[model samples]
Target: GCIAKNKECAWFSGEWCCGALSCKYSIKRNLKICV
Candidate 1:
């Protein structure tokens, strides 16, 4: 798991609004590496 600054449990646990904006964008970008 990654430690994001000022992030809540919902964000990290893939719940609530996890990546409703920039964070989601960054995650999508990073996923390319895994692919």
Candidate 2:
């Protein structure tokens, strides 16, 4: 399943994003999230 907006995602897990969102790396959280 693809990750939705504002949700945490796996950077190395293909970054499967949902809808209009894309997987991005957040510097503040130091994590990959959908944005």
Candidate 3:
């Protein structure tokens, strides 16, 4: 239920909710986050 900017998100699921930026993958952390 993540729907914030620059917040933690799940790339595998439909949790990220960035209207403009959207979700992105971070290789450094090997995770998905809203950027």
**Tens digit per residue, CA lDDT, model 2, 1-35:** 77876678876777578887778888877777888
Question: Ranking under TM-score, best-scoring first?
Answer: 2, 3, 1
Q: In terms of TM-score, which candidate is strongest?
A: 2
Better of 1 and 3 by TM-score: 3
lDDT of 1: 0.35
What overall lDDT goes with each candidate model?
Answer: 0.35, 0.78, 0.66
What is the lDDT, from 0 to 100, of the residue 25 in candidate 2? 83
Per residue, candidate 1 scores C-alpha lDDT tens digits across 1-35 of 53243343333555343233223333634431111
Q: What is the C-alpha lDDT profile of model 3 across 1-35, one tens digit per residue?
A: 55565566766666557575677776776776777
Question: What TM-score do all the candidates reach, one by one?
Answer: 0.15, 0.52, 0.42
By lDDT: ranked, best first? 2, 3, 1
Deviation in Å, model 2, residue 18 alpha carbon: 4.4
The per-residue C-alpha lDDT of model 3 at residue 2 equals 51
**Which of the two candidates, 1 or 2, achieves a greater TM-score against the reference?**
2
Candidate 3 — worst ten consecutive residues by lDDT sum?
Answer: 1-10
Alpha-carbon RMSD, candidate 1: 8.6
